[PDB]
Design a protein around this nucleic acid. Structure first.
Lengths: 52, 92, 29, 25, 76, 135, 254, 98
RNA sequence: UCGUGCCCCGUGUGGCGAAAGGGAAGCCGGUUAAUAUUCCGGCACCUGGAUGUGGGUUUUGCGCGGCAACGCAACUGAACGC
């Protein structure tokens, strides 16, 4: 038999721990990013360490 | 030429070649009164076909279930018969 | 009439010849 | 090959199959 | 990279739907011309002798497929 | 005494048909300009008829009783002769040296061989010729 | 990154066989076929059946993995297990000789032979299968044909006499609704039966009624799965009749 | 009473929304109760009855022709097998530097 | 379908343990103040999946050729074994 509990162990499901506002922190303002913008069509960001 | 070759309600009368189940559904029973067998009254009417088989064929053709055959006998579990210990040790 | 295309292949279960059949081993389970 | 006889034979086998399927201490 | 030795096969390759582009490379020292068509997997090259028929083959190539002549310098 | 004669049954030991059973149609001991060695023109079975049991349907039996034949020029060194002999009247001069030189005659010859071999198999005789060799 | 393995994705995850489905649901084959008929799980066909199962033949039945996982949450599985446990308790009471306890446990079994209704309630199934009364009216053709056919059959273990009488009751109630609202449009005396065409709320409903004779039950049909269809169509027609009688402002049941 | 139309998956899968397989040759959905034709009436019109009669007649004729052709093929196969067996019995009787 | 069962099989038992052992697959050119077989351009490959087209096989149903070693763009194959 599968579990059919008489009470939930956790009353409230927790929110997404890694949502998009925590994923994207801020872009990079260095000359590497600024060169890549014009020469590579590439934007450089500083993001969360846990994000893929 | 290849493009032209690619360019070039259902019926229960003719079915696809591929089966759905244990066998392919046969052609239906003949539902027609022969000219000898016509009658002139509703009282003497000879009903034709079987409505149970008609509904069963309708279900199979529409695909709600697959065509299976009846299993009249199932293979019994192979067992060995022995005498009980009390009946073996009965003494008189 | 039986089809002549049928043939019999008896198996002899002596030592060294064909594989022993599956017998009741309930005495030795 | 009389079509009336062929249809009567077909209906005869059909009805035959239908009836044959429906049938010391 | 694959070399196509059949004009008919090159025509079907150019009429294939994956043909992004084609280019013309003329080598005058060797007196040769190369038709290079770019597809999804392979770049197909047809090698012909420099001739008016070779120049005319561009007309029998599909008009939808873009064709460009290779300049003398591969500018980055 | 000579034993690579007409209707002699042999086993093919080299080539694509290694292990197959053939019947000799025409022995050439002296040799040919194309084949300067002792050889033979043979016909045999490439795909044997399958096993048939008592509870099988007649359509499945008729499907599994088919025989795929082949015709071959074969060296004597690539044949293993058998003591069995398969005398078939339909195989008399069905193939020659000219048969293998143009394609079409090979398929009507194979059709003739298939017909006669299936008739002999349905007769129920010469069961060793139709059971495949297990090696 | 890491190399995928063969047969771990695609049609192998998209389909499963009937054996894998019954092993997943831990059901007996009659219960599985009954639940599939009631919930509308239909047989499927992969493009290559060997990619799903290497032992699959042309007679192998395939279903959707998501369909089986949807069946996994059906409340009727608990009802099946409860009824099996209750039958074991009844057998225990009969074997120990507690006849009063056996009767008291048997009145909780809700048998079709004593109630005239299906053993398991399909009310939650009806709403899931027919989101709209228009869908109910569109399946009423098959529903009415099925019930009008089984109104004239002898009793079996699959469909008992009280159940057949209930089918007759529902057919008569629907006929009374049609008579009162004057919704019957066409009729046809064919060689196989009487065709009736009615018009209920813009939907044309055509069904076939056998002539009143001894109907022959043949061995070429699966009568037990036909009986499961009878239970489903009975449960549907009860709600359809209630909605129609309430719509024309009559007391249901009459 | 109860009136319809008025983690568990409350959302049904799209696999259930897929339509069932139809065994019809054209691939279209077969109706549950198809509309009958006037030739199926208990007191049918003459033209409809004659049309149905000739269709079933030609079907029976071609079926009988097919089964007679198959019987001829089977008896020819048995005759060929018998002749080959007779020939086998007769053969066994006769055997007994560059 | 006595509908709530039956059949087959044996070989055991899980995990960790190598940036020098075994191992699916990427090269060239250019580019930064500092990275590059990782960026850019060009040209590829591997693994897995789904499903088309072309071509192949088949009315002698599951290819053809070579004496042979074997060849050819394909050319059915579950359990169980080598």
């Amino acid at each position: 038999l599968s579990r059919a509990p008489k009470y939930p162990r956790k009353s409230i499901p927790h929110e997404p721990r890694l949502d998009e506002h925590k994923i994207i922190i801020h872009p990079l303002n260095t000359e590497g990013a600024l060169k890549k913008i014009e020469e590579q069509n590439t934007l450089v960001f500083i993001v969360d360490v846990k994000a893929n | 030429q290849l493009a032209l070759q690619k360019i070039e309600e259902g019926d229960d009368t003719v079915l696809r070649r591929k089966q759905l189940g244990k066998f392919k559904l046969p052609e239906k029973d003949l539902e027609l009164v022969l000219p000898d067998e016509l009658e002139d009254s509703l009282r003497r009417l000879k009903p034709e076909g079987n409505l149970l088989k008609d509904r069963y064929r309708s279900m199979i053709v529409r695909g709600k279930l697959e065509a299976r055959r009846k299993i009249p006998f199932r293979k019994q579990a192979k067992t060995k018969l022995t005498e009980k210990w009390t009946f073996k040790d009965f003494r008189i | 009439p039986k089809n002549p295309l049928l043939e019999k292949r008896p198996r002899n279960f002596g030592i060294g010849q064909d594989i022993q059949p599956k017998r009741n081993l309930s005495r030795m389970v | 090959l009389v079509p009336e006889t062929l249809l009567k034979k077909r209906k005869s086998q059909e009805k035959a199959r239908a009836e044959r399927a429906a049938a010391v201490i | 990279p694959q070399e196509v030795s059949d004009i008919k096969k090159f025509i079907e390759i150019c009429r294939r739907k994956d043909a992004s582009s084609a280019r013309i490379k003329k080598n005058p020292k060797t007196q040769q011309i190369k038709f290079k068509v770019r597809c999804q997997r392979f770049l197909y090259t047809l090698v012909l002798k420099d001739s008016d028929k070779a120049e005319k083959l561009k007309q029998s190539l599909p008009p939808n497929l873009q064709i460009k002549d290779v300049p003398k310098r591969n500018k980055r | 005494m000579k034993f690579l004669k007409t209707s002699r049954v042999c086993l093919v030991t080299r080539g694509r048909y290694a292990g197959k059973k053939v019947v000799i149609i025409q022995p050439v001991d002296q040799g040919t300009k194309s084949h300067p060695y002792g050889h033979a023109l043979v016909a045999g079975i490439e795909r044997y008829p399958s096993k048939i049991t008592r509870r099988m349907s007649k359509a499945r039996i008729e499907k599994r009783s088919k025989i795929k034949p082949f015709i071959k020029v074969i060296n004597y060194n690539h044949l293993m002769p058998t003591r069995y002999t398969l005398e078939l009247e339909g195989l008399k001069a069905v193939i020659n040296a000219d048969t293998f030189k143009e394609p079409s005659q090979r398929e009507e010859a194979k059709k003739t061989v298939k017909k006669v071999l299936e008739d002999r198999y349905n007769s129920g005789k010469n069961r060793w010729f139709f059971t495949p060799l297990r090696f | 990154g890491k190399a995928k393995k063969k047969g771990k994705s695609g049609a192998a995850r998209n389909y499963m066989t009937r054996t894998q489905a019954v092993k997943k649901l831990q059901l007996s084959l009659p219960d599985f076929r009954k639940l599939c008929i009631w919930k509308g799980i239909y047989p499927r066909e992969p493009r290559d059946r060997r990619k799903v199962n290497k032992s699959a033949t042309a007679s192998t039945t395939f279903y959707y993995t998501k369909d089986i996982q949807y069946l996994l949450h059906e409340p009727l599985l608990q009802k099946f297990r409860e009824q099996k446990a209750l039958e074991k308790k009844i057998s225990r009471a009969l074997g120990r000789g507690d006849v009063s306890n056996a009767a008291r446990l048997e009145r909780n079994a809700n048998l079709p032979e004593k109630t005239g209704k299906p053993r398991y309630t399909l009310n939650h199934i009806i709403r899931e299968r027919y989101p709209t009364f228009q869908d109910a009216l569109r399946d009423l053709d098959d529903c009415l044909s099925m019930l009008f056919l089984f109104a004239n059959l002898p009793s079996t273990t699959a469909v008992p006499a009280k159940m057949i009488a209930r089918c007759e009751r529902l057919c008569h109630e629907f006929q009374h609704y049609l008579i009162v609202t004057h919704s019957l449009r066409k009729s046809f005396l064919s060689i196989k039966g009487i065709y009736y065409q009615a018009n209920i709320q813009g939907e044309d409903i055509l069904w076939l009624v056998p002539y009143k004779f001894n109907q022959r039950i043949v061995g070429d049909v699966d009568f037990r799965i036909m009986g499961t269809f009878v239970e489903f169509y009975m449960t549907l027609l009860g709600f359809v009749n209630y909605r129609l009688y309430t719509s024309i402002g009559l007391k249901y049941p009459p | 009473t109860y009136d319809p139309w008025a983690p568990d998956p409350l959302k049904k899968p799209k696999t259930l929304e897929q339509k069932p397989i139809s065994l019809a040759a054209n691939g279209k959905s077969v109706p549950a109760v198809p509309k009958p034709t006037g030739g199926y009436s208990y007191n049918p019109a003459f033209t409809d009855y004659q049309q149905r009669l000739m269709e079933e007649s030609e079907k029976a004729i071609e079926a009988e022709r097919k089964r007679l052709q198959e019987l001829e093929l089977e008896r020819q196969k048995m005759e060929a097998a018998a002749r080959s067996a007779a020939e086998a019995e007769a053969a066994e009787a006769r055997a007994e530097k560059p």
